[PDB]
Paper text:
The ferrous iron and 2-oxoglutarate (2OG)-dependent HIF prolyl hydroxylases (PHDs/EGLNs) catalyse trans-4-prolyl hydroxylations on HIFα subunits, thus promoting their binding to the von Hippel–Lindau protein (VHL), a targeting component of a ubiquitin E3 ligase, and signalling for HIFα degradation under normoxic conditions. The PHD-catalysed hydroxylations of HIF-1α/HIF-2α in higher animals occur in amino- and carboxy-terminal oxygen-dependent degradation domains (NODD and CODD). The three human PHDs exhibit different NODD/CODD selectivities, with PHD3 being substantially more selective for CODD than PHD1/2 (refs 16). Biophysical analyses employing crystallography and NMR reveal that the molecular basis of PHD isoform and variant selectivity involves enzyme–substrate interactions involving β2/β3 loop residues (that bind the LXXLAP motif) and helices α3 and α4, regions which display sequence variations between the PHD isoforms.
A PHD2 R396T variant, present in breast carcinoma, and an R396A variant efficiently hydroxylate NODD, but both manifest loss of CODD activity. We then used a ‘disulfide cross-linking' strategy to form stable PHD2.Mn.NOG.NODD complexes, where PHD2QM1 (C201A/P317C/R281C/R398A) or PHD2QM2 (C201A/V314C/R281C/R398A) and NODDDC (L397C/D412C) are cross-linked via appropriately positioned cysteines. Interestingly, Asp571CODD is also important in VHL–HIFα binding, where it salt bridges with Arg107VHL3334; the high conservation of Arg396PHD2 and Arg107VHL implies that both these interactions are important in PHD–VHL evolution.
Residue numbers in the entry:
A (entry chain C), B (entry chain D): 395 to 413
C (entry chain B): 190 to 400
D (entry chain A): 189 to 403
Amino acid sequence: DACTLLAPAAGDTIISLCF
Amino acid sequence: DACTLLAPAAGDTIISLCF
Amino acid sequence: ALKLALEYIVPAMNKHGICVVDDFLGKETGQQIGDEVRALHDTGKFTDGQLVSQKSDSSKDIRGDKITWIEGKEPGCETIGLLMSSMDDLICHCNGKLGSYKINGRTKAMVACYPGNGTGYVRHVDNCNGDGRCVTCIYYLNKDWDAKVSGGILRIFPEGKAQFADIEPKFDRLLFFWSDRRNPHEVQPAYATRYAITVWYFDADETAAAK
Amino acid sequence: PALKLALEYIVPAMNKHGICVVDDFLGKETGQQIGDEVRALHDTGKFTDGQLVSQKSDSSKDIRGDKITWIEGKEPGCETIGLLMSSMDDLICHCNGKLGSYKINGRTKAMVACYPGNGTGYVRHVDNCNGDGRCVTCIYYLNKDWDAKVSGGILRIFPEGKAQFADIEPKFDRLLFFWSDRRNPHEVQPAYATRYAITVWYFDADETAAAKVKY
Ligand SMILES: O=C(O)CNC(=O)C(=O)O
Ligand SMILES: O=C(O)CNC(=O)C(=O)O
Ligand SMILES: [Mn+2]
Ligand SMILES: [Mn+2]
Protein backbone atom coordinates (compact mmCIF):
# COMPACT_ATOMS: atom_id res chain seq x y z
CA ASP A 1 0.00 0.00 0.00
CA ALA A 2 1.01 3.66 0.41
CA CYS A 3 2.56 3.14 3.85
CA THR A 4 6.14 3.19 2.59
CA LEU A 5 5.38 6.51 0.87
CA LEU A 6 5.42 8.08 4.36
CA ALA A 7 8.02 6.02 6.24
CA PRO A 8 11.49 7.46 6.99
CA ALA A 9 14.34 5.95 5.00
CA ALA A 10 16.55 3.76 7.19
CA GLY A 11 19.81 4.45 5.35
CA ASP A 12 21.93 2.02 3.37
CA THR A 13 23.90 0.69 6.36
CA ILE A 14 23.11 -1.63 9.28
CA ILE A 15 25.70 -1.63 12.07
CA SER A 16 26.12 -4.91 13.96
CA LEU A 17 25.43 -4.80 17.69
CA CYS A 18 25.06 -6.85 20.88
CA PHE A 19 25.99 -10.23 19.35
CA ASP B 1 6.29 18.48 -5.03
CA ALA B 2 4.65 15.73 -2.94
CA CYS B 3 1.74 17.85 -1.68
CA THR B 4 -0.74 16.37 -4.17
CA LEU B 5 0.13 12.88 -2.91
CA LEU B 6 -1.85 13.79 0.22
CA ALA B 7 -4.56 16.04 -1.30
CA PRO B 8 -8.20 14.93 -1.62
CA ALA B 9 -9.18 14.09 -5.18
CA ALA B 10 -11.62 16.73 -6.44
CA GLY B 11 -13.01 14.45 -9.13
CA ASP B 12 -13.47 15.74 -12.67
CA THR B 13 -16.79 17.62 -12.97
CA ILE B 14 -17.46 21.15 -11.71
CA ILE B 15 -21.06 22.35 -11.31
CA SER B 16 -21.69 25.95 -12.35
CA LEU B 17 -22.90 28.19 -9.54
CA CYS B 18 -23.87 31.77 -8.65
CA PHE B 19 -23.18 33.20 -12.11
CA ALA C 1 -29.13 33.22 4.22
CA LEU C 2 -27.98 36.85 3.88
CA LYS C 3 -28.26 37.14 7.68
CA LEU C 4 -26.07 34.21 8.71
CA ALA C 5 -23.63 34.56 5.81
CA LEU C 6 -22.99 38.31 5.80
CA GLU C 7 -23.19 38.66 9.59
CA TYR C 8 -21.37 35.51 10.77
CA ILE C 9 -19.66 33.37 8.13
CA VAL C 10 -18.05 36.21 6.17
CA PRO C 11 -16.43 37.90 9.21
CA ALA C 12 -15.27 34.61 10.73
CA MET C 13 -13.76 33.42 7.43
CA ASN C 14 -11.93 36.65 6.61
CA LYS C 15 -10.60 36.99 10.17
CA HIS C 16 -9.75 33.32 10.86
CA GLY C 17 -10.27 31.33 7.67
CA ILE C 18 -12.34 28.85 9.72
CA CYS C 19 -16.06 29.04 10.50
CA VAL C 20 -18.21 26.59 12.48
CA VAL C 21 -22.02 26.69 12.32
CA ASP C 22 -23.86 24.40 14.71
CA ASP C 23 -27.47 23.22 14.35
CA PHE C 24 -27.34 24.13 10.67
CA LEU C 25 -30.42 22.24 9.44
CA GLY C 26 -31.93 20.94 12.68
CA LYS C 27 -32.37 17.46 14.10
CA GLU C 28 -35.17 16.35 11.75
CA THR C 29 -33.41 17.32 8.52
CA GLY C 30 -30.03 16.26 9.87
CA GLN C 31 -31.49 12.87 10.74
CA GLN C 32 -32.96 12.41 7.27
CA ILE C 33 -29.58 13.27 5.72
CA GLY C 34 -28.08 10.69 8.06
CA ASP C 35 -30.57 8.08 6.87
CA GLU C 36 -29.87 8.79 3.20
CA VAL C 37 -26.09 8.65 3.74
CA ARG C 38 -26.29 5.38 5.68
CA ALA C 39 -28.55 3.97 2.97
CA LEU C 40 -25.96 4.85 0.31
CA HIS C 41 -23.34 3.15 2.50
CA ASP C 42 -25.39 -0.02 3.04
CA THR C 43 -25.63 -0.48 -0.71
CA GLY C 44 -21.87 -1.08 -0.72
CA LYS C 45 -21.30 1.64 -3.33
CA PHE C 46 -18.61 3.48 -1.36
CA THR C 47 -15.06 3.26 -2.73
CA ASP C 48 -11.69 4.18 -1.26
CA GLY C 49 -10.90 7.87 -1.02
CA GLN C 50 -8.63 8.97 -3.87
CA LEU C 51 -5.71 11.39 -3.89
CA VAL C 52 -4.84 14.04 -6.47
CA SER C 53 -1.56 12.22 -7.19
CA GLN C 54 -2.29 8.53 -6.58
CA LYS C 55 0.65 6.12 -6.58
CA SER C 56 -0.60 2.89 -4.96
CA ASP C 57 -3.84 1.00 -5.53
CA SER C 58 -4.29 1.05 -1.73
CA SER C 59 -3.79 4.28 0.22
CA LYS C 60 -5.63 3.76 3.52
CA ASP C 61 -2.53 4.93 5.39
CA ILE C 62 -2.88 8.37 3.73
CA ARG C 63 -6.68 8.57 3.88
CA GLY C 64 -8.66 5.60 5.18
CA ASP C 65 -12.17 6.77 4.37
CA LYS C 66 -14.59 5.29 1.87
CA ILE C 67 -16.67 7.76 -0.13
CA THR C 68 -19.27 8.26 -2.85
CA TRP C 69 -20.07 11.31 -4.99
CA ILE C 70 -23.63 12.70 -5.03
CA GLU C 71 -24.99 15.37 -7.37
CA GLY C 72 -28.08 15.92 -5.20
CA LYS C 73 -30.51 14.96 -7.97
CA GLU C 74 -30.33 11.19 -7.48
CA PRO C 75 -33.80 9.79 -6.67
CA GLY C 76 -33.59 9.00 -2.96
CA CYS C 77 -31.05 11.70 -1.99
CA GLU C 78 -33.57 14.55 -1.81
CA THR C 79 -32.50 15.70 1.66
CA ILE C 80 -28.83 15.71 0.67
CA GLY C 81 -29.92 17.76 -2.34
CA LEU C 82 -31.62 20.12 0.10
CA LEU C 83 -28.42 20.38 2.15
CA MET C 84 -26.57 21.27 -1.05
CA SER C 85 -29.13 23.89 -2.09
CA SER C 86 -28.80 25.47 1.35
CA MET C 87 -24.99 25.56 1.14
CA ASP C 88 -25.01 26.92 -2.42
CA ASP C 89 -27.56 29.55 -1.41
CA LEU C 90 -25.28 30.81 1.37
CA ILE C 91 -22.11 30.72 -0.71
CA CYS C 92 -23.68 32.64 -3.57
CA HIS C 93 -24.96 35.30 -1.19
CA CYS C 94 -21.34 35.52 -0.01
CA ASN C 95 -19.76 36.50 -3.36
CA GLY C 96 -17.56 39.57 -3.15
CA LYS C 97 -17.43 39.36 0.65
CA LEU C 98 -15.27 36.23 1.13
CA GLY C 99 -11.82 37.76 0.85
CA SER C 100 -11.54 38.37 -2.88
CA TYR C 101 -12.93 35.07 -4.17
CA LYS C 102 -15.63 35.06 -6.85
CA ILE C 103 -17.18 31.64 -6.34
CA ASN C 104 -18.75 30.25 -9.49
CA GLY C 105 -18.52 26.47 -9.17
CA ARG C 106 -18.47 23.49 -6.86
CA THR C 107 -17.66 19.81 -6.85
CA LYS C 108 -20.23 17.13 -6.42
CA ALA C 109 -20.91 16.29 -2.79
CA MET C 110 -18.42 13.84 -1.28
CA VAL C 111 -20.15 11.54 1.18
CA ALA C 112 -17.36 10.09 3.33
CA CYS C 113 -17.25 7.41 6.02
CA TYR C 114 -14.26 6.56 8.18
CA PRO C 115 -15.13 2.99 9.27
CA GLY C 116 -13.60 3.15 12.72
CA ASN C 117 -10.69 0.76 13.26
CA GLY C 118 -8.26 3.67 13.55
CA THR C 119 -8.68 5.07 10.04
CA GLY C 120 -8.04 8.74 9.43
CA TYR C 121 -6.48 11.30 7.12
CA VAL C 122 -2.87 12.42 7.52
CA ARG C 123 -2.13 16.15 7.63
CA HIS C 124 -2.67 17.64 4.17
CA VAL C 125 -3.86 20.69 2.25
CA ASP C 126 -6.93 20.38 0.05
CA ASN C 127 -5.76 22.76 -2.70
CA CYS C 128 -1.96 22.53 -3.00
CA ASN C 129 -1.35 23.72 -6.53
CA GLY C 130 -4.01 26.33 -7.26
CA ASP C 131 -6.64 23.95 -8.65
CA GLY C 132 -9.42 26.51 -8.06
CA ARG C 133 -10.82 25.11 -4.82
CA CYS C 134 -10.98 28.08 -2.46
CA VAL C 135 -13.56 27.14 0.20
CA THR C 136 -13.96 23.71 1.80
CA CYS C 137 -17.38 23.00 3.32
CA ILE C 138 -18.06 19.90 5.43
CA TYR C 139 -21.38 18.82 6.99
CA TYR C 140 -21.06 16.29 9.83
CA LEU C 141 -23.64 13.60 10.69
CA ASN C 142 -22.40 12.05 13.96
CA LYS C 143 -24.77 12.11 16.94
CA ASP C 144 -23.33 11.91 20.46
CA TRP C 145 -19.77 11.77 19.13
CA ASP C 146 -17.37 11.42 22.07
CA ALA C 147 -13.87 12.21 20.80
CA LYS C 148 -12.37 10.84 24.04
CA VAL C 149 -13.52 7.34 23.02
CA SER C 150 -13.98 7.54 19.24
CA GLY C 151 -11.27 10.03 18.24
CA GLY C 152 -11.76 11.26 14.69
CA ILE C 153 -11.15 14.90 15.60
CA LEU C 154 -10.41 17.21 12.67
CA ARG C 155 -7.27 19.10 13.70
CA ILE C 156 -6.53 22.18 11.59
CA PHE C 157 -3.13 23.93 11.86
CA PRO C 158 -3.53 27.58 10.80
CA GLU C 159 -0.38 28.34 8.81
CA GLY C 160 2.03 30.71 10.54
CA LYS C 161 0.95 30.02 14.14
CA ALA C 162 1.70 27.09 16.45
CA GLN C 163 -1.91 27.13 17.67
CA PHE C 164 -4.43 24.74 16.13
CA ALA C 165 -8.20 24.27 15.97
CA ASP C 166 -9.76 20.94 16.94
CA ILE C 167 -13.21 20.38 15.42
CA GLU C 168 -15.38 17.52 16.62
CA PRO C 169 -17.37 15.93 13.80
CA LYS C 170 -20.64 16.76 15.54
CA PHE C 171 -24.10 16.09 14.13
CA ASP C 172 -25.64 18.92 12.08
CA ARG C 173 -22.39 20.92 12.14
CA LEU C 174 -21.36 22.93 9.08
CA LEU C 175 -17.68 23.79 8.73
CA PHE C 176 -16.07 26.33 6.39
CA PHE C 177 -12.37 26.85 5.87
CA TRP C 178 -9.91 28.04 3.23
CA SER C 179 -8.89 25.12 1.03
CA ASP C 180 -5.38 26.36 0.19
CA ARG C 181 -2.10 25.98 2.12
CA ARG C 182 -3.35 28.35 4.85
CA ASN C 183 -5.35 25.49 6.44
CA PRO C 184 -3.46 22.19 6.52
CA HIS C 185 -5.53 19.67 8.44
CA GLU C 186 -5.79 16.02 9.47
CA VAL C 187 -8.49 13.60 10.59
CA GLN C 188 -7.01 11.97 13.67
CA PRO C 189 -7.58 8.20 14.04
CA ALA C 190 -11.27 7.37 14.43
CA TYR C 191 -12.64 4.41 16.38
CA ALA C 192 -16.30 4.71 15.36
CA THR C 193 -18.07 5.14 12.04
CA ARG C 194 -17.52 8.79 11.08
CA TYR C 195 -19.82 10.32 8.45
CA ALA C 196 -19.48 13.68 6.73
CA ILE C 197 -20.52 15.43 3.52
CA THR C 198 -17.99 17.71 1.82
CA VAL C 199 -18.43 20.33 -0.89
CA TRP C 200 -15.54 22.27 -2.44
CA TYR C 201 -16.30 25.67 -3.98
CA PHE C 202 -14.26 26.98 -6.90
CA ASP C 203 -12.96 30.49 -7.49
CA ALA C 204 -13.72 31.79 -10.98
CA ASP C 205 -10.33 33.33 -11.79
CA GLU C 206 -8.16 30.69 -10.12
CA THR C 207 -10.17 27.89 -11.74
CA ALA C 208 -9.90 29.44 -15.21
CA ALA C 209 -6.15 29.94 -14.69
CA ALA C 210 -5.71 26.35 -13.51
CA LYS C 211 -7.44 25.07 -16.67
CA PRO D 1 23.30 3.52 35.89
CA ALA D 2 22.43 2.41 32.36
CA LEU D 3 21.71 -1.13 33.58
CA LYS D 4 19.35 -0.29 36.45
CA LEU D 5 17.51 2.15 34.17
CA ALA D 6 17.14 -0.44 31.40
CA LEU D 7 15.79 -3.16 33.68
CA GLU D 8 13.81 -1.05 36.16
CA TYR D 9 12.35 1.60 33.82
CA ILE D 10 12.92 1.03 30.09
CA VAL D 11 11.91 -2.61 29.77
CA PRO D 12 8.66 -2.46 31.81
CA ALA D 13 7.51 0.74 30.09
CA MET D 14 8.25 -0.68 26.64
CA ASN D 15 6.56 -4.03 27.27
CA LYS D 16 3.49 -2.55 28.98
CA HIS D 17 3.04 0.55 26.78
CA GLY D 18 5.40 0.40 23.80
CA ILE D 19 6.61 3.92 24.67
CA CYS D 20 9.23 5.08 27.15
CA VAL D 21 10.43 8.60 27.99
CA VAL D 22 13.68 9.14 29.92
CA ASP D 23 14.32 12.75 30.85
CA ASP D 24 17.77 14.11 31.73
CA PHE D 25 19.48 11.22 29.98
CA LEU D 26 23.07 12.51 29.83
CA GLY D 27 22.94 15.74 31.84
CA LYS D 28 23.23 19.42 31.04
CA GLU D 29 26.89 19.60 30.02
CA THR D 30 27.00 16.54 27.76
CA GLY D 31 23.67 17.49 26.22
CA GLN D 32 24.91 20.99 25.46
CA GLN D 33 28.06 19.60 23.85
CA ILE D 34 25.88 17.39 21.64
CA GLY D 35 23.93 20.52 20.72
CA ASP D 36 27.20 22.18 19.71
CA GLU D 37 28.23 19.26 17.51
CA VAL D 38 24.86 19.10 15.73
CA ARG D 39 24.73 22.87 15.22
CA ALA D 40 28.24 22.67 13.77
CA LEU D 41 27.13 19.89 11.41
CA HIS D 42 24.28 22.21 10.43
CA ASP D 43 26.37 25.37 9.97
CA THR D 44 28.65 23.48 7.58
CA GLY D 45 25.85 22.71 5.12
CA LYS D 46 25.91 18.95 5.71
CA PHE D 47 22.12 18.59 6.03
CA THR D 48 19.89 17.36 3.20
CA ASP D 49 16.16 16.68 2.83
CA GLY D 50 14.74 13.78 4.79
CA GLN D 51 14.08 10.79 2.54
CA LEU D 52 11.14 8.37 2.48
CA VAL D 53 11.27 4.61 1.95
CA SER D 54 9.48 4.92 -1.41
CA GLN D 55 9.78 8.50 -2.64
CA LYS D 56 7.85 9.67 -5.70
CA SER D 57 8.54 13.43 -5.77
CA ASP D 58 12.06 14.81 -5.49
CA SER D 59 10.74 17.51 -3.12
CA SER D 60 8.66 15.96 -0.32
CA LYS D 61 8.71 18.69 2.34
CA ASP D 62 4.96 18.27 2.79
CA ILE D 63 5.44 14.68 3.93
CA ARG D 64 8.51 15.42 6.07
CA GLY D 65 10.10 18.85 6.05
CA ASP D 66 13.25 18.05 8.00
CA LYS D 67 16.91 18.29 6.99
CA ILE D 68 19.05 15.25 7.73
CA THR D 69 22.56 13.93 8.06
CA TRP D 70 23.73 10.38 8.86
CA ILE D 71 26.47 10.06 11.48
CA GLU D 72 28.44 6.90 12.23
CA GLY D 73 29.72 8.34 15.53
CA LYS D 74 33.42 8.01 14.66
CA GLU D 75 33.66 11.20 12.58
CA PRO D 76 36.31 13.51 14.08
CA GLY D 77 34.36 16.39 15.59
CA CYS D 78 31.38 14.19 16.58
CA GLU D 79 32.91 12.57 19.68
CA THR D 80 30.03 13.50 21.99
CA ILE D 81 27.44 12.23 19.51
CA GLY D 82 29.57 9.09 19.44
CA LEU D 83 29.30 8.91 23.22
CA LEU D 84 25.52 9.30 22.98
CA MET D 85 25.39 6.42 20.50
CA SER D 86 27.56 4.33 22.82
CA SER D 87 25.23 5.05 25.75
CA MET D 88 22.15 4.11 23.73
CA ASP D 89 23.71 0.93 22.34
CA ASP D 90 24.94 -0.10 25.77
CA LEU D 91 21.39 0.39 27.04
CA ILE D 92 19.67 -1.53 24.24
CA CYS D 93 22.04 -4.50 24.35
CA HIS D 94 21.33 -4.91 28.06
CA CYS D 95 17.63 -5.24 27.18
CA ASN D 96 17.92 -8.31 24.94
CA GLY D 97 15.79 -11.16 26.22
CA LYS D 98 13.56 -8.63 28.01
CA LEU D 99 11.79 -6.90 25.10
CA GLY D 100 9.27 -9.59 24.28
CA SER D 101 10.66 -11.81 21.55
CA TYR D 102 12.91 -9.13 20.02
CA LYS D 103 16.64 -9.90 19.77
CA ILE D 104 18.34 -6.64 18.79
CA ASN D 105 21.50 -7.25 16.79
CA GLY D 106 21.84 -4.13 14.64
CA ARG D 107 21.20 -0.43 14.30
CA THR D 108 21.19 2.34 11.74
CA LYS D 109 23.62 5.20 11.79
CA ALA D 110 22.47 8.21 13.82
CA MET D 111 20.04 10.43 11.91
CA VAL D 112 20.66 14.00 13.02
CA ALA D 113 17.58 16.00 12.06
CA CYS D 114 16.52 19.64 11.94
CA TYR D 115 13.06 21.04 11.33
CA PRO D 116 13.83 24.68 10.40
CA GLY D 117 10.71 26.20 11.92
CA ASN D 118 8.39 27.75 9.31
CA GLY D 119 5.66 25.21 10.08
CA THR D 120 7.66 22.20 8.90
CA GLY D 121 6.87 18.77 10.28
CA TYR D 122 6.20 15.11 9.55
CA VAL D 123 2.72 13.80 8.79
CA ARG D 124 1.40 10.82 10.74
CA HIS D 125 3.39 7.74 9.70
CA VAL D 126 4.76 4.36 10.79
CA ASP D 127 8.53 3.94 10.92
CA ASN D 128 8.45 0.24 9.90
CA CYS D 129 5.29 -0.99 8.16
CA ASN D 130 6.51 -3.69 5.74
CA GLY D 131 8.67 -5.52 8.28
CA ASP D 132 12.05 -4.03 7.36
CA GLY D 133 13.68 -5.18 10.62
CA ARG D 134 13.38 -2.00 12.69
CA CYS D 135 11.82 -2.87 16.05
CA VAL D 136 12.79 0.03 18.36
CA THR D 137 12.95 3.73 17.54
CA CYS D 138 15.25 5.80 19.77
CA ILE D 139 15.30 9.61 19.62
CA TYR D 140 17.48 12.07 21.57
CA TYR D 141 16.17 15.65 21.74
CA LEU D 142 18.31 18.76 22.10
CA ASN D 143 15.92 21.72 22.24
CA LYS D 144 16.43 23.84 25.35
CA ASP D 145 13.54 25.83 26.83
CA TRP D 146 11.08 24.44 24.30
CA ASP D 147 7.69 26.16 24.56
CA ALA D 148 5.32 24.10 22.43
CA LYS D 149 2.61 26.76 22.67
CA VAL D 150 4.67 29.15 20.50
CA SER D 151 7.00 26.73 18.69
CA GLY D 152 4.82 23.65 18.11
CA GLY D 153 6.82 20.63 17.04
CA ILE D 154 5.13 18.17 19.39
CA LEU D 155 5.52 14.51 18.47
CA ARG D 156 2.05 13.00 18.75
CA ILE D 157 2.03 9.20 19.02
CA PHE D 158 -1.28 7.46 18.33
CA PRO D 159 -1.06 4.06 20.07
CA GLU D 160 -3.05 1.70 17.88
CA GLY D 161 -6.42 0.41 19.03
CA LYS D 162 -7.09 3.21 21.53
CA ALA D 163 -8.39 6.76 21.22
CA GLN D 164 -5.59 7.97 23.50
CA PHE D 165 -2.46 9.64 22.19
CA ALA D 166 0.85 10.64 23.77
CA ASP D 167 2.24 14.14 23.19
CA ILE D 168 6.04 14.19 23.47
CA GLU D 169 7.62 17.60 23.77
CA PRO D 170 11.13 17.63 22.19
CA LYS D 171 12.69 18.71 25.48
CA PHE D 172 16.46 19.01 25.88
CA ASP D 173 18.24 15.82 27.02
CA ARG D 174 15.11 13.68 26.54
CA LEU D 175 15.53 10.11 25.30
CA LEU D 176 12.49 8.48 23.68
CA PHE D 177 11.89 4.79 22.94
CA PHE D 178 8.96 3.27 21.09
CA TRP D 179 8.10 0.24 18.96
CA SER D 180 8.81 1.06 15.32
CA ASP D 181 6.03 -1.00 13.73
CA ARG D 182 2.35 -0.18 13.14
CA ARG D 183 1.58 -0.08 16.88
CA ASN D 184 2.99 3.48 17.03
CA PRO D 185 1.82 5.67 14.16
CA HIS D 186 3.09 9.16 14.94
CA GLU D 187 3.51 12.64 13.51
CA VAL D 188 5.71 15.67 14.11
CA GLN D 189 3.26 18.54 14.27
CA PRO D 190 4.27 21.85 12.61
CA ALA D 191 7.32 23.49 14.19
CA TYR D 192 7.87 27.25 14.28
CA ALA D 193 11.35 27.09 15.80
CA THR D 194 14.48 25.17 14.90
CA ARG D 195 13.89 21.62 16.13
CA TYR D 196 16.86 19.26 16.57
CA ALA D 197 16.86 15.54 17.33
CA ILE D 198 19.07 12.47 16.84
CA THR D 199 17.42 9.16 15.94
CA VAL D 200 18.74 5.59 16.05
CA TRP D 201 16.70 2.61 14.83
CA TYR D 202 17.50 -0.87 16.18
CA PHE D 203 17.04 -4.09 14.22
CA ASP D 204 15.71 -7.46 15.31
CA ALA D 205 17.88 -10.40 14.23
CA ASP D 206 15.10 -12.64 12.90
CA GLU D 207 12.98 -9.88 11.35
CA THR D 208 16.03 -8.38 9.63
CA ALA D 209 17.08 -11.76 8.22
CA ALA D 210 13.56 -12.25 6.87
CA ALA D 211 13.71 -8.70 5.50
CA LYS D 212 16.96 -9.44 3.68
CA VAL D 213 15.31 -12.42 1.99
CA LYS D 214 12.19 -10.40 1.11
CA TYR D 215 14.27 -7.62 -0.47
O1 LIG E 1 -13.78 14.69 7.39
C1 LIG E 1 -13.16 15.67 7.89
O2 LIG E 1 -13.46 16.27 8.96
C2 LIG E 1 -11.95 16.20 7.14
N1 LIG E 1 -11.84 15.57 5.86
C3 LIG E 1 -10.83 15.89 5.03
O3 LIG E 1 -9.78 16.58 5.54
C4 LIG E 1 -10.86 15.51 3.56
O4 LIG E 1 -11.64 14.59 3.18
O5 LIG E 1 -10.12 16.10 2.73
O1 LIG F 1 11.60 13.80 15.39
C1 LIG F 1 10.58 13.32 15.94
O2 LIG F 1 10.04 13.73 17.00
C2 LIG F 1 9.92 12.13 15.25
N1 LIG F 1 10.65 11.75 14.08
C3 LIG F 1 10.11 10.89 13.20
O3 LIG F 1 8.85 10.43 13.40
C4 LIG F 1 10.92 10.42 12.00
O4 LIG F 1 11.96 11.04 11.67
O5 LIG F 1 10.55 9.41 11.35
MN1 LIG G 1 -9.00 17.76 3.51
MN1 LIG H 1 8.98 8.32 12.52
